[PDB]
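Every protein is a chain of amino acids, and every chain bends into a shape of its own. Below is the pair of lines this work produces for a single protein:
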Amino acid sequence: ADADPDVLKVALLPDENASELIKRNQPLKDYLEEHLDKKVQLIVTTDYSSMIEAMRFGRIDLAYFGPLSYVMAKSKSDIEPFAAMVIDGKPTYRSVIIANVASGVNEYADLKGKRMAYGDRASTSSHLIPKTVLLETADLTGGQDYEQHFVGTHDAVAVNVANGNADAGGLSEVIFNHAAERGLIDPSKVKVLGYSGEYPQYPWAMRSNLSPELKTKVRDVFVGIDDPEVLRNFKAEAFAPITDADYDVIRNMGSLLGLDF
């Protein structure tokens, strides 16, 4: 492995359409090239598992993880978290549970015997969180009391609920709220059932076998971002420092999915 590579391979969690992600992250790519004296290569893998595996095998250098995919990767490889975005005045985000207006699902309890859409099995806000909400509020167990299907991206969850392939679904609040704006869905075809509580934001992480000097520079450059043109695409105010212990809440919730830490 190279401790100080000329090119940084930077992976983005595939929570949306790859073209949408590359677009959103272009100003950040430019900012990093300037302040790090590196070439940056943006990567979007096919799914969450393929991103976790690429990290374990040393094929990527930096990664923008979701909370659950981060703790899974941390259990398999030597990585360290270093920054998360502050959006709408907080370093947290929520899951939204939505229903198709034509399904007869008017509240959580009505999901009994119906079709629920989740994103990736390794997703926090499109799997772990909404599954937990349904259990705690309505005593409903996935696969036992309702049908569960995994459709991949958060974009796909919104699309499958809106077109009638699923009766209800769970996804990130922010991704849902911009789905009509992007023309993914007809907003009159869906309604909101409820929201989760607030959970820690997506962590940026890097392989720990980068040089100590390079690791310090990466941390400092991200936490120092105050350029409005980089922040605007993310609707963010800042990049905050983080620690591994900030994700213990997710480790404990993951017991429900059979994960041990």
In short: Residues 9 and 60 are 5 Å apart (CA to CA). The first strand starts at residue 7 and ends at 12. Residues 92-199 form a domain with the D-Maltodextrin-Binding Protein; domain 2 fold (CATH 3.40.190.10).
